[PDB]
Subunit: 188 residues, 7 copies
């Protein structure tokens, strides 16, 4: 991370209301991104925010932490898929303000059902199964709302890894526009 | 964690009386959390403090350190569940000023009984067993007073991992309100 | 640990004559605490000092370095138990200035006999045994005086891990008062 | 990396709109380079940018994130191959603004087909197989266009590791010119 | 280690001519202690210096570098045993300026003969044997001179680990006084 | 690395247009060296640069990146061998400005053929074989040009490790002068 | 390493033309030592420099880099042995300016023949043997000139680890004077 004069590159971008997510989503990442979101919203609750997304996914709770925040602050959060928006990453992509969900020409998106683990007594394994099946329904329901796709379709399309091109993601309703030029973005 | 000119993202939020508990609770974390609280209470014993919670919990003793400090200082501590508030995290979530305990739409909460270990001679195992059971009952008593539930209900509901949605947590008495809009908070 | 404005949360508290012990006690930790105590004593040998204790204890020699420095300097050292004060931690807690040894409602204190080990020749094993038995007697005598309990009692009550609640510690004479309010301390 | 009183050598060069890519390409490297590009573009959308490349390659999604950002910003991104530009490194080199894709005299370039893996059920291995074969076409089509070589020539030529000298890279269409002098660069 | 506002806690004490030695003794620690002694000497060759000691000792050559430097520089070096001063650590404690060698009430001191190793041919083991026997004898001669005890007695007393309280240390001649109050120190 | 007030020792020397290369040559080292050369050339493309070389060698491509950059920039680059210049290190040494390639009295240089490895199918092993045999031939031609030795001599002399004294390095044509005094350098 | 005020203890000493070598000699160390030497010589080629030495030795080539640089620069480099100077460390001690090679009362010096390895074909074992033997001879020739002993005696006396007291080192011609007081130093 190079320094700008003193800011680290990411911090310099943060200054222009730009948040970069380019790693898997774990508690730390959500924690950092949530603080950044709250900070900006405090700075100016009216000014829009840009969240770049390039991650393989991660913890469902970490993602919902980021998700609920994006929706909770007044600022509208624009999402840009760069590289790959997989699993919870793709979910955050579609979580962006309607009409402000972008991706780049060669961007990729991948949706699929939650993954988990259960170990121990039958009673414990059942508790885990029940919980992960519930999380899948919640996620699916929210995804159907974001994309405009029927719940039944999300369910069926997420059974196994579903990789999509930037065009397909548009077609599916995961993003609103594919950015090509430095002017295609509404920012300028 | 990015910087803020020269601060640290969390130090930045700290400046606005916001502490972020976003990791497993251990002696380290407890000491940082307690210090931040003591600091803020010194800065202004009148203004309230907001403690965001997103952790899988941890040490009972570390937790109570945070718990006692919360009730100790003059400032009223408001809790906010983001992502997941499990085990001691949930205990702490419910420890915020009555009426100022929050969670976001998709936040999750989980309560369960203490976990521990014992090794050695029968005598030592019994000393340890007596300690954990006693801690369990102590925690149950505080959780009951906090939620309003009857002790016997808390005892049975924590036998196994008990996962709750923000609405279930609200209806249980773990939190007071589910934030949805930036102005749904009592602050803004 | 976050920063304050430049500072460190602990560094910031140190400015208010507050030292935080929240880990196992080893040489490193002891040197830090001691240097902090000497530094504060150099600043104003007349001003009081608050030492927060949340520690499972550790090295006996390391703890005595802290102990001796506490008594050595002019400032009166007040101890406050947070979470857990076990073995040497409990000794340090009881070591605070008579009348200024506090604990919080849910704090725990654990007293027990010294732990150690020895390997090698019978002669070597006897040297260690002789020593650990002597340290225990030295420690027991100090504790008895600091608590008011008769030596015989300290001896029998430490044969095995003895966990005590804030109330029991008060009763045992390990602490002077249990805190709950912000202005009920010696500072107000 | 040495300092420049107070900058980081790489940070100092970033000031002159120079970005050094000198390691394998992963999500970290891509997030840093993409951020540097955005920053520069934000600094002055009119000025050019130099991207020095010397890397063994890396993640395809990480590289495309860099690729898409290069075309996406208004500024022209000139690429200079130094040492070795392999795998996604060569891809990126060829992605520079046409006419401004350079290589020093003894530079090396290596192109080859993607690499990956798959474990699991036939259905899952099929999905992974289809994806990788698809990414291969996608990249091959971009390289075909950037270089002017027909798709199937790119396919056959990248079947096994293909090492090209600077003269061969020029001939192939990967670079526009082999630099020798400092001022010989279109820039100065 | 906390900071003091731009200094390190130890650097702050260094400003008051106080050097802390609270870790095993190796080349590193020695290089730092010597450097500090030299610095303090250049600053004011007339002002006294205090060396707090709490270490299990360590390398002999390292310890002697510190020993010789203490004698070499003009400032009188006062030593204060805190916690434990064993092996080379005890040796350095006894090396303080006569009449200014201290220990706190519950400090501990341990003396013993050198430890070492040897691998290889007979000739090689003999060389090492002679060296360590020589080192032991050298150290014993200094301890004798410093304590006032006869050489024969130092030899017999260090055959095996020999632990002593502060009183026993005083009565043996390893220290000159046991400090109790912040006023018992020759300083104030 | 110590500091000079506030640069780090290498930064301080970088200010006098002196670059230090005292480690094995890998992409990371190459990237730092190249960036230093570029920075200096940007600072003042007229003044000469001094490159101190003490390294066992390393990556051929990492070395060539440095090689090319040296020739690439406007500033003439003087090389000085201290300790040892082996393999690619010796190569860089010889790559210094003609007449300005130095070595100290007891400096050591070594030349040998490239090292590498191959694993996998015969086809893949052939690709690796042809490439290392090509690189060797490429390096050999540059060494011949830089030393004045006929290719055939360079080929036979690099078959096995070939260590040379500073004087032998001079007679071979690897360097031009053997420094002894502070003025024997063309700078003074 | 503590800080002196904006300065690292060693850095503070470097200001007074004092370089501390208290570790094994590897490429890193040599690089840092050579740089500090060049720096000091650039700062003022007239003022002498003091190189303290407490090191087990290490790489021969790294050692010679330091050696050649000490002789090379104009400033006279005084060496002071503290603790132990072995292998290349003793070589460097003996390398100081004639008449300015010191040692402290209990300092120790050790000389031995080079150590190395060799694996592979008989031809390569031979290349390695000749070199190790060549290096031994080169080093013994330099040590002889600087000590006054004939090569023949230097070789014999280093066949095996040869530990010498400060007094023995003086008589052998490795040092010129054994310092005792801070006045017996020509600088003071």
């Amino acid at each position: 991370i190079p320094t700008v004069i003193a800011y680290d590159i990411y911090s310099r971008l943060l200054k222009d209301r730009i948040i970069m997510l380019g790693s898997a989503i774990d508690d730390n990442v959500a924690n950092s991104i949530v603080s950044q979101l709250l900070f900006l919203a405090a700075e100016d609750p009216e000014k829009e925010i840009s969240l770049y997304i390039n991650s393989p996914g991660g913890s469902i709770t970490a993602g919902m932490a980021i998700y609920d925040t994006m929706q909770f602050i007044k600022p509208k959060v624009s999402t840009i898929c760069i590289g790959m928006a997989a699993s919870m990453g793709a979910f955050l992509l579609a979580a962006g303000e309607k009409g402000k969900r972008y991706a780049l020409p060669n961007s990729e998106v991948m949706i699929h059902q939650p993954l988990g683990g259960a170990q121990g007594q039958a009673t414990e394994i059942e508790i885990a199964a029940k919980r992960i099946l519930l999380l899948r329904d919640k996620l699916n329901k929210v995804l159907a709302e974001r994309t405009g796709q029927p719940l039944e379709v999300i369910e069926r399309d997420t059974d196994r890894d579903n990789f999509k091109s930037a065009e397909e993601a548009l077609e599916y309703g995961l993003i609103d526009k594919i950015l090509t030029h430095l002017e295609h973005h509404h920012h300028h």
